[PDB]
Amino acid sequence: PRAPRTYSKTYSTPKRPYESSRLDAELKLAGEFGLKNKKEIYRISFQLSKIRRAARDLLTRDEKDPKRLFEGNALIRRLVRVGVLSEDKKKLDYVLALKVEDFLERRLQTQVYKLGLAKSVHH
Amino acid sequence: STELTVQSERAFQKQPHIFNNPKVKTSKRTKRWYKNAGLGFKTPKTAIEGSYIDKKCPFTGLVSIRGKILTGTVVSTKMHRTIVIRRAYLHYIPKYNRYEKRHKNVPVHVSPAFRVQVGDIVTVGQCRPISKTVRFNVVKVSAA
Amino acid sequence: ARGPKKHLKRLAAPHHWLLDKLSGCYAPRPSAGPHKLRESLPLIVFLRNRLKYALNGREVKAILMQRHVKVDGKVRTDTTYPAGFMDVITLDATNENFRLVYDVKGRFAVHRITDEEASYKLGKVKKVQLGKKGVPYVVTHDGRTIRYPDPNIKVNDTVKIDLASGKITDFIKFDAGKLVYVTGGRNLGRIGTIVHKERHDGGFDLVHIKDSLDNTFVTRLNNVFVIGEQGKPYISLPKGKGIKLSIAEERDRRRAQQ
Amino acid sequence: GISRDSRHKRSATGAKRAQFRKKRKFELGRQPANTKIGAKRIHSVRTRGGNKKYRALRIETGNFSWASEGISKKTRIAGVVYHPSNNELVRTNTLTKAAIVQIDATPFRQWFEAHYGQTLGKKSKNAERKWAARAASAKIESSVESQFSAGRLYACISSRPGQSGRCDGYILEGEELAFYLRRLTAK
RNA sequence: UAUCUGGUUGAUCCUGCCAGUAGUCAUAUGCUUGUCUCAAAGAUUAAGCCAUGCAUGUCUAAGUAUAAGCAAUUUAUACAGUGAAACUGCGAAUGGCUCAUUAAAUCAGUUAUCGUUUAUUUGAUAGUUCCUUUACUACAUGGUAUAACUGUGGUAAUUCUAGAGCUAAUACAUGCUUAAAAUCUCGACCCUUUGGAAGAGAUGUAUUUAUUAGAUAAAAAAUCAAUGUCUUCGGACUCUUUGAUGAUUCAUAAUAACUUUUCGAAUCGCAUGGCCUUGUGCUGGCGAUGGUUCAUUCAAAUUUCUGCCCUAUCAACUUUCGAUGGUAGGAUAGUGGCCUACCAUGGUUUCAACGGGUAACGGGGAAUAAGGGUUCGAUUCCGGAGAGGGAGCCUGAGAAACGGCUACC
RNA sequence: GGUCGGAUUUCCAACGGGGCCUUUCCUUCUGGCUAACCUUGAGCUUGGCGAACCAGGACUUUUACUUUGAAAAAAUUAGAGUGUUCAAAGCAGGCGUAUUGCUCGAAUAUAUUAGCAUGGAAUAAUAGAAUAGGACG
RNA sequence: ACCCACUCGGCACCUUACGAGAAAUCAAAGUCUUUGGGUUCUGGGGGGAGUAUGGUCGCAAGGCUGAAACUUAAAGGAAUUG
RNA sequence: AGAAUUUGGACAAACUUGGUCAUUUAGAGGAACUAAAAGUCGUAACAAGGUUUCCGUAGGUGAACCUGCGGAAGGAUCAUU
RNA sequence: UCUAAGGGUCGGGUACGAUCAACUU
RNA sequence: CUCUUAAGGUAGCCAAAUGCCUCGUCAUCUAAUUAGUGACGCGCAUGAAUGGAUUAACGAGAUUCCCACUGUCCCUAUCUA
Ligand SMILES: [Mg+2]
């Protein structure tokens, strides 16, 4: 008898467990960005899919719909704010197909490398 | 109705708190009390000029019409001062996106002011529990 | 069952109190009073969540029976006294007064009024009857029974009370073009300048309402509170004046100043 | 005890409703009074929310009203002569509502002489002044003076003895008397 | 995030299932287990059984204190400091747990009470109670018992109690003090007729019954029954009073009565002030508690419409003894076959009645999902029901109460 | 682009709305505002037809369907803002001379079906005047 | 009675495939992923099994309705080469 | 004022004997189904399977099965102007 | 000791009244 | 496989009123059963109008068990004509 605490999980495993294409693709992201897990990769695919889901449904709505305008710009602004969405791409269509590793670029682990001071992502 | 031989019951049939003084003489020998149910339903001329008592009548009785107003076709008129109407509607099943026919029998009370036959279209008004199963009172018949 | 319920769990209290779900299982149950349970301030919410003049339920109490807070000119040393629509809460300390008026979003707002305004309040009459020995009376929305009113005061009319006696100083009739405050429903907390009303004889009267920006909406007669005429109202409206600007316009305003 | 609910006896379709919700107090019934005549003994009953309810037993007298004359007098009840609901209530002289009874009928006679003064059945100048004003109004109906000869007027109890604790009624007049005379005189 | 793959053949295209695959806020189990936040947890089988210890008591300035308790007011020789115990008043009908029963039942959304009860709040609301009401009276206030306590005992025991002796009330218990005015009843006497009178009673509220009012879309005339406020007895005639609902026999008022008769303060703390013909004389605040009625609030009970899983190897069911309805009455807080007496033969059903099963409390909701859907919901909220199985009942506003009682198993 | 990426007027266009006429009443009586007034006083005056606002009246062919609106507790689902250091979370928080204090929030979306009000009137039904008590009067 | 031409209705037949089907084949078995004219019945891997039991019909033989336990990775269709 | 006790009534626990329904469960004996085993007897089907095969029905035989009547091509014939 | 139901014969200008008598439940 | 008949007892049924052995064997009924019932069947010596197998209703027919009931009995006593 108390207010329950909302909690959700932040990853989803791929449907096919063993395929050479995905396994070799994920390991590319691990080494290039210094990730300890495939769950480190599945997490972005979960967030990217949710962001893509929201944009996919909003685009089916007719233009100038007050819901599409309010949530569309909020979603663009939030993505632009963290740098994952470039400034010139604000048309609610580049949101759909940004990349798997565009979010992975803004990670502080790989962001330190860009501003020197580590000379390796592991460092 | 057949005027229901008003004094058939063992008890004297009278409108409560309606006293006609035998000391004086006045036209309309039997003083009568009648009310209008409101909501646009109009008192039939039978109710005003009738001789029944029927304390459950919505126009001359002690009952009042309030709540849901329903309509249905008469399907059974074999009881005394009470008939059964049937409400036919359609029920929506969202899996198949199409409807289905359903019905519900409603026992309703009919005043002697109305003559209802099987097939008559009658609108009813909700009243206080009249009996175990009767909660509606016939208020207008619109069939000939 | 078996009697009245003396407890009110959280997640069952009205949402306009804005009580956080965590940090507690129960909520202050408003005791019997002049207002419905579902529409009530009660002071512990006012003094701990609205004014921040206290932090626990204890110092809310310790404020009460030292007689710093009075509701409508009476002390009301009760933790959960139900205060509803447009009640005057006078705090002797700091010589400041209060009025309970809905914000634009429908929540109770901290409205500060001058001392002279705290000398009166309005009430939406609910019934006009004949008392014992043929004495007419009116019953406002807060249960205040006023005997011997003006004969012109019919139902759904606002009367003005003196907050020192039960006498009625003035009243406003019900008609199109009068200023109205919305109490309840989706449009709760808006000022709407009644344009016309539709009867639907049989119950649940409907009245059409058009605010200052021509954003018309329809609300039931049970949720409409006449507060005066076009232009000046009979009370001090809170900031925003209940216009209900669109959600796409709030973010325009929120970015205007920062 | 006696239940007044409907989770007992069958639904309108004949189905037998199952056991549910053991008898609640707010749907209780109680034993009938079966009020009698003589030796007034009224027992108070405590009801919901207090509200003392008087279960009258063996009531002796009651307030009866003369509808035409608009007066009410206290008279002794002689017995029960007719009851539409049951004859066993007549046989046992039970007093319920709408029971035709015969009453003392004397106190109405002294009022008639004090008001009109002429007669029933068969000095100061101020008395005639009232009598002169109340003239041509002592011809109520022939079926009532005949009862005054036997000193027992028929009446109908209009109160509920087991609920209010009293027994009150009115004098049968006009059509009510005519209707109940063909019931009594039939043999 | 709309995806498939292996298996029948010597080989091939199909149907088709088996197997694989991914998820479960679905459990269990094995191996392993460094950190932080958060967190379910005897539901499943047994609503099976329970040792033990707790889980409901409570006081202010303001009901009652001679503790033969504690210190000390010193403002007090009656009390007014604190304060065990006990009577009194409230509470214990909330909360907490569980899911056994339950399939138009519960429950969801949506209506009604013009068909009822309502402790407690919140706002108003009793000049009318000395009874043959000019001694009958205490109205600067009227009686009784009892607890605590003292003392004597019973049994081994229980929150067991007896006999004897006091004292209290916001316990019980009777019981008045406040106008007037107006109106209806009888009515002495003058006696006139146009009739007036002296005098007395009744008239709060609550209960019960009967009766009356509770009107109202429009305007002018005829003369009768007699004048009807005042008359130039021509008649000017107007003032003539009426609220709410969609709707009432509504609110409310009036008349006649009935009641073994409710209420109309014999209560408590503080401040102590003004008036004089200075008497323990008269007025005088801030409150607390109580009290009849109405309204409000917290509710409760009943109730309208639509909606529930699998079953025909369940097709007819209900109606003796209640089934469907009428009348009348009882009972209820109220409507109602809720029950009784008489009467009628009615009522449901292939649009799935009735019966059976449920490893069924119902919903808000959860899992997986292109779309549709499929499965789940003992369990943080809402509403039900239960306290080992049944039944019955006291107290109270509220219980068919079980950390209440009684009986049976 | 007459303001320096922000809006307006007379606009060529498209898109959906309202009213009127073409045989086309798409009910109206007692009355108020008499209203939009033939109403004009000399260029701002004394006087038209009631719903455009109403109170009461007579009937009103009934459904399905669809638009909109109120309703459908909170939590939960989606979603806006924001330092839990990120995140699941939570509804906080932010800004000053920090010596006196100021202030934005805690929205919104979703919510089968049943019930209520409103516009539409295609689609699919229903009834009307035929051994005429048929309608206007 | 025949011949020619046309037309309605019928039992059929021949060729071809825009079309369908896994194919054999099909003017319907076509107008079905570019999936919706109306409607009734029936099937959900193979055995057990149309068996057991209960109903109901029959003189009977039997008809209609109709499981479960258990067992199994194939049964089956049409074509190709041997 | 008033305890024990007491008459009738409604509510009705519970027990005994019957009846019915449902679920488990014993049983001599009988008759099936499935699996396994290199069992015994035959060769009924698949080729015109050596009597074409199958369907309904009836009777019979150690067993596969045989025969009578009516039907079918899933026939071994799309065919005799 | 009561209650109820079950009948015959007579009277209507061109819905009832009176009298009588059975044991059946 | 063999001797053999006119044919070699089919469908049924059974220690049956028909089975010698025999108080057949198994199960049930009981504390205990040559009794009863249900099965089994190389049946001295069952069997089809010598009619076979069933069969509702019926019977002063034969037999077994159970309930009720009791002087049948334990175990006798008493009364009347
Ligand atoms: Mg509270």
Curated annotation (Swiss-Prot), chain A:
GO terms for biological process: maturation of SSU-rRNA from tricistronic rRNA transcript (SSU-rRNA, 5.8S rRNA, LSU-rRNA); ribosomal small subunit biogenesis; translation. The keyword Manganese does not apply. The keyword Phosphoprotein applies. GO terms for molecular function: rRNA binding; structural constituent of ribosome. Component of the small ribosomal subunit (SSU). Mature yeast ribosomes consist of a small (40S) and a large (60S) subunit. The 40S small subunit contains 1 molecule of ribosomal RNA (18S rRNA) and 33 different proteins (encoded by 57 genes). The large 60S subunit contains 3 rRNA molecules (25S, 5.8S and 5S rRNA) and 46 different proteins (encoded by 81 genes). Interacts with snoRNA U3. uS11 interacts with MPP10. Component of the ribosomal small subunit (SSU) processome composed of at least 40 protein subunits and snoRNA U3. Present with 106000 molecules/cell in log phase SD medium. Belongs to the universal ribosomal protein uS4 family. This is Small ribosomal subunit protein uS4A. It comes from Saccharomyces cerevisiae (strain ATCC 204508 / S288c). The gene is RPS9A.
UniProtKB/Swiss-Prot annotation, chain B:
InterPro entries: NA-bd_OB-fold, Ribosomal_uS17, Ribosomal_uS17_arc/euk, Ribosomal_uS17_CS, Ribosomal_uS17_N. There is a cross-link at K14, K45, K55, K56, K78, K95, K104, K132, K140 (Glycyl lysine isopeptide (Lys-Gly) (interchain with G-Cter in ubiquitin)). Gene3D superfamilies: 2.40.50.1000. One of its GO terms (cellular component) is 90S preribosome. Keywords: Acetylation, Cytoplasm, Isopeptide bond, Ribonucleoprotein, Ribosomal protein, RNA-binding, rRNA-binding, Ubl conjugation. The modification N-acetylserine is found at S1. N-terminally acetylated by acetyltransferase NatA. It is found in: Cytoplasm. The keyword RNA-binding applies. Coiled coil: none annotated. The keyword RNA-binding applies. Disulfide bonds: none annotated. GO terms for molecular function: rRNA binding; structural constituent of ribosome. It comes from the Eukaryota. GO terms for biological process: maturation of SSU-rRNA from tricistronic rRNA transcript (SSU-rRNA, 5.8S rRNA, LSU-rRNA); ribosomal small subunit assembly; translation. There are 2 genes for uS17 in yeast. Component of the small ribosomal subunit (SSU). Mature yeast ribosomes consist of a small (40S) and a large (60S) subunit. The 40S small subunit contains 1 molecule of ribosomal RNA (18S rRNA) and 33 different proteins (encoded by 57 genes). The large 60S subunit contains 3 rRNA molecules (25S, 5.8S and 5S rRNA) and 46 different proteins (encoded by 81 genes). Belongs to the universal ribosomal protein uS17 family. This is Small ribosomal subunit protein uS17A. It comes from Saccharomyces cerevisiae (strain ATCC 204508 / S288c) (Baker's yeast). The gene is RPS11A.
Swiss-Prot record, chain C:
Gene3D superfamilies: 2.30.30.30, 2.40.50.740, RNA-binding S4 domain. Keywords: Cytoplasm, Isopeptide bond, Phosphoprotein, Ribonucleoprotein, Ribosomal protein, RNA-binding, rRNA-binding, Ubl conjugation. Its main location: cytoplasm. The modification Phosphoserine is found at S31, S246. Belongs to the eukaryotic ribosomal protein eS4 family. Residues 41-104 form the S4 RNA-binding domain. This is Small ribosomal subunit protein eS4A. The modification Phosphothreonine is found at T114. It comes from the Eukaryota. PROSITE patterns: RIBOSOMAL_S4E, S4. InterPro entries: KOW, Rib_uL2_dom2, Ribosomal_eS4, Ribosomal_eS4_C, Ribosomal_eS4_central_region, Ribosomal_eS4_central_sf, Ribosomal_eS4_KOW, Ribosomal_eS4_N. One of its GO terms (biological process) is translation. Component of the ribosome, a large ribonucleoprotein complex responsible for the synthesis of proteins in the cell. The small ribosomal subunit (SSU) binds messenger RNAs (mRNAs) and translates the encoded message by selecting cognate aminoacyl-transfer RNA (tRNA) molecules. The large subunit (LSU) contains the ribosomal catalytic site termed the peptidyl transferase center (PTC), which catalyzes the formation of peptide bonds, thereby polymerizing the amino acids delivered by tRNAs into a polypeptide chain. GO terms for cellular component: 90S preribosome; cytoplasm; cytosol; cytosolic small ribosomal subunit. It is found in: Cytoplasm. There is a cross-link at K61, K133, K160, K167, K173, K178, K210, K232 (Glycyl lysine isopeptide (Lys-Gly) (interchain with G-Cter in ubiquitin)). One of its GO terms (molecular function) is RNA binding. Present with 573 molecules/cell in log phase SD medium. The gene is RPS4A. Coiled coil: none annotated.
From Swiss-Prot, chain D:
The modification Phosphoserine is found at S65, S68, S72, S85, S142, S143, S146, S149. CDD domains: Ribosomal_S8e_like. Residues 1-30 are annotated as: Disordered. GO terms for biological process: maturation of SSU-rRNA from tricistronic rRNA transcript (SSU-rRNA, 5.8S rRNA, LSU-rRNA); translation. Belongs to the eukaryotic ribosomal protein eS8 family. The keyword Manganese does not apply. Keywords: Cytoplasm, Phosphoprotein, Ribonucleoprotein, Ribosomal protein. NCBIfam families: eS8. Component of the ribosome, a large ribonucleoprotein complex responsible for the synthesis of proteins in the cell. The small ribosomal subunit (SSU) binds messenger RNAs (mRNAs) and translates the encoded message by selecting cognate aminoacyl-transfer RNA (tRNA) molecules. The large subunit (LSU) contains the ribosomal catalytic site termed the peptidyl transferase center (PTC), which catalyzes the formation of peptide bonds, thereby polymerizing the amino acids delivered by tRNAs into a polypeptide chain. One of its GO terms (molecular function) is structural constituent of ribosome. Pfam families: Ribosomal_S8e (PF01201). It is found in: Cytoplasm. InterPro entries: Ribosomal_eS8, Ribosomal_eS8_CS, Ribosomal_protein_eS8_euk, Ribosomal_Se8/biogenesis_NSA2. Present with 15900 molecules/cell in log phase SD medium. Disulfide bonds: none annotated. One of its GO terms (cellular component) is cytosol. This is Small ribosomal subunit protein eS8A. The keyword Transmembrane does not apply. It comes from the Eukaryota. The modification Phosphothreonine is found at T61, T106.
